[PDB]
Structures are given as C-alpha cells and as structure tokens.
Amino acid sequence: GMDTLLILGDSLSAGYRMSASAAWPALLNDKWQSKTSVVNASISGDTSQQGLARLPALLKQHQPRWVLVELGGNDGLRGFQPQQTEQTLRQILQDVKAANAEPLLMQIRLPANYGRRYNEAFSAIYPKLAKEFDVPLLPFFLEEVKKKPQWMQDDGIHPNRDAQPFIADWMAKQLQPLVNHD
C-alpha cells in the first residue's frame, strides 16, 4: 500500500516564505509518486510545544505510518531550557507511538556561534530521545545548506527555494531504508 509520512516540523520543513509546493516535503512527495504520500504539517516559527499541540488532530486525520519530527530549533533559538524541549519531544514521541505510527526524530543543532554549553545540551536531547524510544535519528541538513549562499534567503537564516530540491533529494536518500520502495 501507499503509506503516509507525516512531517511535523517548523520552517525548515514548511519552507520559509514560500509556497507549500516549493518546500522539500512536497518535492519529496512528487519524487515518490504515490509510492508513499508525504503530508507536510509544518509551520514556520513553531516551538516543539506548538507542534505537539497540532499533533493529535494530525494523527487522527492522516493516520500516518511514520511521523518525522523536526522540532525544537525554535525553542533553542529562544534559549528555553533544554529539559523542556526534551520533555515536549518525549511526549510527541509517545503520542506518535500510541497512534500506531513510527516516529523518526531529526537531530537539531544550533549554529557554531551559539553559546556552546547550551548548544551542546540542546543537541544532546536528540540522540538521547532516539535511544530512549529506539527510533531512527535522522541527520540535520541546515549547516550544510548554509554553506551555499545560493541556497539561502537574504537573511542568511532560512534556506531558499533553490535549496529545496537538494534537500528533498538528500532526504529521500535518508528515508530510503524506512519506506522500502520497489
């Protein structure tokens, strides 16, 4: 069957200031041509808590086989306590599993110039949770994308539309073992 991958993300998945159809999850949906459906449920600026608030309706609506969780970066960019992000992501993971879906957790990191103890504590939550729940820990693309000015919006913060095909292709590779297409 044609399973659904739900993406529960922030602007890194929604695309910042662009059409939904331009963002990499839609490009991935197109690449997969109904082998698998990708539903992007991402909102620019969302904290982990905001994503968690949206999750139950999405699980009910979409009954996904997998949920790619790409959240917490906004919490970290706002300096909130890592344990709160960890606990929120924990609850998301619990809810995904309780809906008979498989979570996939994307590692998030802050940039190299961020406060370093804090950044390390923030980034550590992701491998910890992936081990705790025994779920896939997906790699994070942003630092590599930021190396390409031609893939970044003017702010130097958000990937642009030209980045999206590259991210889609890379994500397809990361997700290949999970969807197991013919």
Ligand SMILES: CCCCCCCC(=O)O
């Ligand atoms: C560096 C951590 C990643 C942050 C991405 C979220 C930005 C936004 O959602 O507008």
